[PDB]
């Protein structure tokens, strides 16, 4: 009874194929827009003052 | 007649 | 001026000081981090610090040699400084012997060691070595006095064992025995047995244990012979004799030759100390 | 079922000696500290001693140093207190409390029952409470406040003031620790707040089972308050 | 017959490959060329936690960004105080072959697992004053390689038998089991919304999974060797991988294809860890050559190193507020950087 | 500071307990028990006295032995074989009744990067039935290129040499022993090998290598 697993694989491949897709430039723009919008709350991208440092 | 000079190291 | 016999002792002292400024400092630095975590570092830490304090007193010897044995300090220093120097030297020798004893214990009895090892015995053995060194030191701390001349005052630190007594042969014999004959026998017997056992079965032969054993024992015996022989020769000689003058002339060269062993001892720990090339960077 | 049981009371003539024992069960006795708190028959609470965990640190009050000692026996799970040369002012009830110290703990959470000891006749932070009698009706809101002398706010950002509740004829209980944290068991209706040297405690939707005496205690350095009562 | 289904599978794979190729218009490298670089990062060590003595294997931060966890081959689980370098607990384990750690989001529970095929849970808020085991979750076949909490009641686990399961701590039974991998799962990461998660196996593939319904919705097959580390982008629309191929890749869910690769010709050792930063601009990786690396997630160029360890760097993590990073190593040392 | 001295004291107590446990848990000897399926590992551990790893321990002449049998769970070996490094020795055992898979496993184990300087003890089990079988049937079937006599000693020496030939590193040593029916005499072999290994390790630690 080795055909059941093959049928399951075919069904899973079809289900994965039925999904939708969008452009890549839009995804890149969204990623860079998020990175630019949240830039003032990253304490590792820029050095921190010795006063606000919790680890001294 | 009983004094013997000795270097510091010894 | 200064006679030829002395002259070499000056450059020997200078070279020993230059080598000892480095060396033991690196050894103590790399062995300080290895405390409470490695039992095989306490012995080397103690030996290195003893050698460091031994070598740090060289400028006093240099100045005493230069200024025709002039002692402006006073009574207190003349009965303090030689005691400390002798204590450091004897502690170094006794630690050198106890390290070999410990190596023999590891080689000929590994099961007992694996069950009853750890800090608590090395610190006791080191304390015992220091105590024996101080006990050997005591007579120098006791019987040292000062004297000076009336018109040409040549103040100098010197020994005067009472007004008139022969209670010096016992002290000289005890010092000679406990400083040369016991450590030599211990080193020779322990290393001979270790070499005999190691080279029996395979996976133990290294052709390096022979090298280190020779480099230790031969150097020790070569470097500490003239010191002891000249000391015992001078201890039994009257202040007025022909050979006494020659021995007094050669005493400083003998001491300068003796210090070479303490100069060399840290070198082996770096040369043959397994893989020791980046532990300074790691520290 | 955490239990703290004390025994060894009675009548002692002046000048005598007596020992009190506090047995413990139901928890890990080897990891907790232990204090001893006493109160006069008609007065507030007073601190006596303190024995640490794995005893290496001891402390005593000014009026009890030299006559009393504190000891512990971990294998037997019991605590001891030896008192010598008792005077006429030592008549009180002696308690047995619990405390564990680490980042985020809650000391003074569990108190004992206590024993009565009677004797026949013959540079400190001060905390003061406002009043001693406040009437209130169920369903209303009340406010309790006490003030200190020096600030209880340390450099690390923690203020140290605790609130306790003692009901009629019962052992006290912990409500608030470090001025903002509710104890594990207190209803959400109780909340405390304050800043600097002024502190307040507010109880909303007052019930019939929340009447008693409230004490505020400091823990900045090695004292209690006067206490205020509520009436129905 | 078998030939017909094999042909159908091949045709479907070719069709999805063609669709993926058609859906791509440009590369991120030529879209990101108009932004300025970040410069050089010179982070330095601030703390060194020396309590362990044998090959620390895992760690996890707390939500308060002050308490830590670590596991060693010696058989101990100790939680540190990051600010003042204190020990607050020391839980003794039953088996010394442990590989994973996890901290509850509420700070009440801690989990562990290893070569015993069992996940165990510990209670930190007992009324007696000591930590105790709460549940013994058993039922897997191979070793456990990752554990992650969802709330105080359910936990998702990955094992070395090509399966992942969702448990119920109150009753200790596998509610939902996930199947489809052909190797053994070595990693697991959870989305911020806690509604989907991804896994990485030794068949050089990864796939997204739904917790509500045990179904797989996507698959990514870009690598060339076993996957070893997984983590999401902060917004939950992308994730990054690390493999023994000495390379890292950035994927995407909406477009469902690879975006960037992070590699150099002078590094030939595998990857042991991966993590982002608070804003997602900086990506951290931990190599087998005794050190780490930091790279721009938008330009694929190095920006510094984190040397200072004397053995393999096995674990890595960044606090929730993004103020510090912690690393562990087989040298039995923990370092806090800033 | 504030009353955090109590927390500092708690940390000191934790550290002291950890140090005591660490110094008390380093007196044991750890061993790995690898081999082919149905080779005799269970028999040798039962005579000498679950789903994952199974460990058994025994004491012999003031020495504590820890023995690990991690062959009961089936998975990729390379994914967890790095956990068993820093072990004293391998206790590989071989049956004499099957065989090429066992030799391939021996080749894989010996030439590993993690086990470069780890000694190996090799056991050849079931000698009597092997002798009976070789008396009944020739051994040339298993080894086509064997051209020696059919005597028991020659065949045993030849197969031992075949197993030992897979070794490549000259620094390590392989202890091979014939474990035919004996009154529990195979513990002495492990004892002697462990004694030699610990002596060599102690000598190396002092710097004499």
Breaks in chain B (C–N beyond 2.5 Å) sit after none
Q: Does F188 touch chain E (CB under 8 A)?
A: no
Q: How far apart are CA C116 and CA E117, in angstroms?
A: 37
Mutate to test the interface with B, among C137, C159, C230 (most CBs of B within 10 A): C159
**Closest chain A C-alpha to E219 CA, distance in angstroms:** 8
Mutate to test the interface with D, among E78, E81, E129, E130 (most CBs of D within 10 A): E129
Q: How far apart are CA E167 and CA C202, in angstroms?
A: 56
- Which residue ranges form the domains of chain D, and what is each CATH number? 3-119 (2.60.40.10), 127-231 (2.60.40.10)
Nearest Cα residue in chain C from B10: C82
CATH class for the domain made up of C4-282: mainly alpha
Least CB-CB distance to D54: which of F2, F7, F13? F13
**Helices C122-142 and C81-108: crossing angle, nearest 10°?**
150
Mutate to test the interface with F, among C204, C211, C266 (most CBs of F within 10 A): C204
* Contact call for E and F: 3+ CB–CB distances under 8 Å: yes
Residues of E in contact with D102 (CB under 8 A): 88
Nearest Cα residue in chain F from D103: F7
Please determine, looking at this structure, whether the domain spanning A3-55 carries the CATH number 4.10.260.10: yes
Q: What is the CA radius of gyration of chain E?
A: 20
The pair of structure tokens assigned to D218 is 């400091």
Least CB-CB distance to D27: which of E67, E88, E129? E129
Taking the domains of chain E in order of start, what are their residue ranges? 1-338
Q: What is the DSSP letter of E279?
A: S
Least CB-CB distance to B9: which of C85, C159, C161? C85
The dihedral region occupied by D143, where left means phi > 0, alpha psi between -120 and 50, and beta the remainder, is beta
Q: How far apart are CA F195 and CA E323, in angstroms?
A: 52
Query: F119-125 and F174-178: which strand pairing?
Result: parallel
Least CB-CB distance to F11: which of E86, E141, E184? E86
Strand partners, E71: E58, E77
- Contacts of D among chains (3+ CB pairs under 8 A): E, F
Q: Which fold has domain E1-338?
A: Methylamine Dehydrogenase; Chain H (2.130.10)
CB-based burial of residue E144 (10 Å sphere; 0-12 exposed, 13-18 middle, 19+ buried)? buried
Strand partners, F178: F124
Q: Is the dihedral of CA C269, C272, C274, C276 positive or negative?
A: positive
Q: What is the DSSP letter of F83?
A: G
Q: How far apart are CA E58 and CA F120, in angstroms?
A: 31
Q: How far apart are CA E87 and CA E130, in angstroms?
A: 14
Least CB-CB distance to A55: which of E237, E256, E338? E338
Q: How far apart are CA C135 and CA E119, in angstroms?
A: 63
**Helices C242-271 and C4-21: crossing angle, nearest 10°?**
20
**Closest chain E C-alpha to A35 CA, distance in angstroms:** 6
| Partner-chain contact F76 E160, CB within 8 Å | yes
Q: How far apart are CA F122 and CA F201, in angstroms?
A: 21
CATH class for the domain made up of F28-197: alpha beta
Q: How far apart are CA C161 and CA C148, in angstroms?
A: 17
CB-based contacts of D118, cutoff 8 Å, min separation 6:
D10, D11, D12, D91
Q: How far is CA D26 from CA C73, D4, D110, E131, in A?
A: 73, 9, 12, 15
Taking the domains of chain C in order of start, what are their residue ranges? 4-282
CB-based contacts of E212, cutoff 8 Å, min separation 6:
E195
Nearest Cα residue in chain C from B5: C158
Q: What is the CA radius of gyration of chain D?
A: 18
Resolution of the determined structure in angstroms stands at 3.2
E160-165 contacts at long range (C-beta below 8 A, 24 or more positions apart): E160/E184, E160/E185, E160/E186, E160/F75, E160/F76, E160/F79, E161/F75, E162/E201, E164/E188, E164/E199, E164/E209, E165/E139, E165/E140
**Closest chain A C-alpha to E16 CA, distance in angstroms:** 6
| Partner-chain contact E279 A7, CB within 8 Å | no
Least CB-CB distance to B8: which of C82, C147, C160? C82
* Contact call for C and A: 3+ CB–CB distances under 8 Å: no
Provide the number of CB pairs (under 8 Å) joining chain A to chain E: 133
- Contacts of B among chains (3+ CB pairs under 8 A): C
Q: How far apart are CA C7 and CA C17, in angstroms?
A: 16
Q: What are the residues of chain C with a beta carbon less than 8 Å away from any beta carbon of chain F?
A: 40, 103, 106-107, 110-111, 113-115, 118, 198, 201-204, 206, 208-209, 212, 269, 272-274
Residues of C in contact with B10 (CB under 8 A): 82, 231, 251, 255
Phi, psi of F3 (to 5 degrees): -65, 10
Whether residue E210 contacts residue E195, with contact meaning beta carbons closer than 8 Å, is answered with yes
User: If we measure between CA atoms, which residue out of D52, D46, D40 comes closest to residue D64?
Assistant: D46
Taking the domains of chain F in order of start, what are their residue ranges? 28-197
CB-based contacts of F12, cutoff 8 Å, min separation 6:
none
CB-based contacts of E256, cutoff 8 Å, min separation 6:
A19, A21, E20, E218, E220
Phi, psi of D78 (to 5 degrees): -150, 150
- Contacts of A among chains (3+ CB pairs under 8 A): E
Nearest Cα residue in chain C from B2: C160
- Contacts of C among chains (3+ CB pairs under 8 A): B, F
Whether residue D19 contacts residue D67, with contact meaning beta carbons closer than 8 Å, is answered with no
| Partner-chain contact D102 F7, CB within 8 Å | yes
Whether residue F33 contacts residue F84, with contact meaning beta carbons closer than 8 Å, is answered with no
| Partner-chain contact B2 C162, CB within 8 Å | yes
Quickly tell me which residue has 């709460």 as its tokens.
Answer: E134
Quickly tell me which residue has 């890990």 as its tokens.
Answer: D28
- E strand or H helix at C122: helix C122-142
The pair of structure tokens assigned to E27 is 């590369």
């Amino acid at each position: 009874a080795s055909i059941a697993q093959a049928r399951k694989l075919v069904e899973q491949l079809k289900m994965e194929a039925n999904i939708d897709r969008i452009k890549v430039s839009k995804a890149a723009a969204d990623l860079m827009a998020y990175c630019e919008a949240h830039a003032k709350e990253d304490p590792l991208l820029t050095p921190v003052p010795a006063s606000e440092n919790p680890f001294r | 007649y009983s004094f013997k000079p000795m270097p510091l190291x010894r | 001026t200064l006679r030829v016999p002395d002259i070499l002792a000056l450059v020997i002292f200078a070279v020993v000081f230059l080598v000892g400024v480095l060396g033991n400092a690196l050894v103590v630095w790399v062995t300080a981090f290895e405390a409470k975590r490695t039992i095989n570092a306490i012995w080397f830490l103690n030996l290195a610090v003893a050698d460091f304090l031994s070598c740090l007193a060289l400028p006093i010897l240099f100045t005493s040699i230069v200024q025709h044995h002039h002692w402006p300090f006073g009574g207190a220093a003349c009965s303090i400084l030689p005691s400390l120097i002798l204590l450091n030297m004897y502690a170094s020798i006794l630690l050198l012997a106890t390290i070999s004893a410990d190596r023999f214990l590891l080689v000929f009895k590994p099961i007992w060691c694996q069950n009853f090892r750890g800090a608590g015995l090395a610190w006791i053995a080191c304390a015992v070595a220091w105590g024996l060194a101080l006990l050997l030191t005591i007579p120098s701390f006791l019987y040292r006095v000062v004297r000076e001349e009336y018109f040409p005052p040549k103040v100098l630190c010197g020994v005067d064992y009472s007004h008139d007594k022969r209670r010096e042969r016992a002290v000289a014999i005890v010092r000679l025995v406990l400083g040369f004959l016991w450590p030599l026998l211990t080193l020779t017997i322990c290393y001979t047995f270790i070499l005999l056992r190691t080279w029996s079965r395979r996976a133990t032969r290294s052709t390096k244990t022979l090298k280190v054993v020779v480099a230790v024992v031969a150097s020790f015996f070569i470097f500490w012979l003239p010191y002891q022989v000249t000391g015992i020769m001078m201890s039994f000689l009257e202040p007025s004799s022909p050979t006494f003058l020659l021995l007094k002339k050669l005493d400083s060269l003998c001491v300068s030759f003796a210090y070479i062993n303490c100069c060399i001892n840290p070198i082996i720990y770096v040369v043959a100390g397994q893989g020791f090339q980046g532990r300074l960077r790691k520290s | 079922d955490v239990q703290l049981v004390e025994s060894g009371g009675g009548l002692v003539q002046p000048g005598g000696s007596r020992k009190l024992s506090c047995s413990a069960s139901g928890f890990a006795f080897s990891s907790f500290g232990m204090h001893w708190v006493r109160q006069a028959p008609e007065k507030g609470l007073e601190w006596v001693a303190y024995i640490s965990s794995g005893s290496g640190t001891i402390y005593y009050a000014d009026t009890v140093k030299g006559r009393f000692t504190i000891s512990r026996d971990d294998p037997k799970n019991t605590l001891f207190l030896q008192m010598t040369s008792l005077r006429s002012e030592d008549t009180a009830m002696y308690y047995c409390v619990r405390s564990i110290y680490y980042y985020g703990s809650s000391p003074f959470d569990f108190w004992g029952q206590g024993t009565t000891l009677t004797v026949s006749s013959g540079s400190d932070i001060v905390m003061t409470q406002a009043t001693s009698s406040v009437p209130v009706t169920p369903g209303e809101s009340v406010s309790i406040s006490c003030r200190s002398s020096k600030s209880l706010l340390h450099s690390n950002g923690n203020t140290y003031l605790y609130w306790f509740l003692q009901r009629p004829g019962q052992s006290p209980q912990l409500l608030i620790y470090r001025m903002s944290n509710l104890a594990s068991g207190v209803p959400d209706r109780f909340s405390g707040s304050g800043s600097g040297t002024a502190f307040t405690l507010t109880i909303s939707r007052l019930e019939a089972e929340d009447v008693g005496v409230y004490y505020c205690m400091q823990h900045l350095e090695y004292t209690f308050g006067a206490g205020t009562k509520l009436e129905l | 017959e078998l030939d017909q289904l094999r042909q159908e599978a091949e045709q479907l794979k070719n069709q999805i490959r063609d669709a993926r190729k058609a859906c791509a218009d440009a590369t991120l490298s030529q879209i990101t060329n108009n932004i300025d670089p970040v410069g050089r990062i010179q982070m330095r060590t601030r703390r060194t936690l020396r309590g362990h003595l044998a090959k620390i294997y895992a760690m996890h931060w707390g939500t308060d960004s002050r308490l830590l966890v670590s596991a060693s081959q010696d058989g101990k689980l100790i939680i540190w105080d990051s600010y003042t370098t204190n020990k607050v607990h020391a839980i003794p384990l039953r088996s010394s072959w442990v590989m994973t750690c996890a901290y509850a989001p509420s700070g009440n529970y801690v989990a562990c697992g290893g070569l015993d095929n069992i996940c165990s849970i510990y209670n930190l808020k007992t009324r007696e004053g000591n930590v105790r085991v709460s549940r013994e979750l058993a039922g897997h076949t191979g070793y456990l390689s990752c554990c992650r909490f969802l709330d105080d009641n359910q936990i998702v686990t990955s094992s070395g038998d090509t399966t992942c399961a969702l448990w119920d701590i109150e009753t200790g039974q596998q509610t939902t089991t996930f199947t489809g991998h052909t190797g053994d799962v070595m990693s697991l990461s959870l989305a911020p919304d806690t509604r989907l998660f991804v896994s990485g196996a030794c068949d050089a593939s990864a796939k997204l999974w739904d917790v509500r319904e045990g179904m797989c919705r996507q698959t990514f097959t870009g690598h060339e060797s076993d996957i070893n580390a997984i983590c999401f982008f902060p917004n939950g629309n992308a994730f990054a991988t690390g493999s023994d191929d000495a390379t890292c890749r950035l994927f995407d869910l909406r477009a469902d294809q690879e975006l960037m690769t992070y590699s150099h010709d002078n590094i030939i050792c595998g990857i042991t860890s991966v993590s982002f930063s608070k804003s997602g601009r900086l990506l951290l990786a931990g190599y087998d050559d005794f050190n780490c690396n930091v790279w721009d997630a938008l330009k694929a160029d190095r920006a510094g190193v984190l040397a200072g360890h004397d053995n393999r760097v096995s674990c890595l993590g960044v606090t929730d507020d993004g103020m510090a990073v912690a690393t562990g190593s087989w040298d039995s040392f923990l370092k806090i950087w800033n | 500071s504030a009353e955090e001295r109590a927390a500092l004291e708690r940390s000191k107590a934790i550290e002291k307990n950890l140090k005591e446990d660490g110094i008390s848990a380093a007196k044991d000897v750890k061993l790995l028990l690898l081999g082919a399926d149905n080779s005799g590992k269970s028999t040798i551990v039962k005579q000498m006295k679950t789903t994952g790893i199974v460990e058994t321990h025994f004491t012999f002449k003031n020495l504590h032995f820890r023995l690990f049998d991690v062959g009961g769970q089936r998975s990729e070996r390379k994914k967890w074989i790095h956990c068993f490094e820093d072990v004293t020795a391998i206790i590989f055992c071989v049956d004499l009744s099957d065989m090429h898979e066992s030799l391939m496993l021996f080749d894989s184990i010996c030439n590993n990067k993690f086990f470069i300087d780890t000694s190996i003890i090799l056991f050849l089990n079931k000698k009597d039935l092997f002798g009976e079988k070789i008396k009944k049937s020739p051994l040339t079937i298993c080894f086509p290129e064997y051209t020696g006599p059919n005597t028991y000693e020659d065949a045993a020496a030849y197969i031992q040499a075949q197993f030992e030939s897979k070794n490549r590193s000259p620094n390590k040593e392989i202890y091979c022993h014939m474990t035919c029916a004996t009154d529990t005499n195979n513990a002495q072999v492990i004892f002697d090998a462990v004694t030699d290994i610990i002596i060599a390790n102690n000598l190396r630690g002092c710097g004499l290598y």
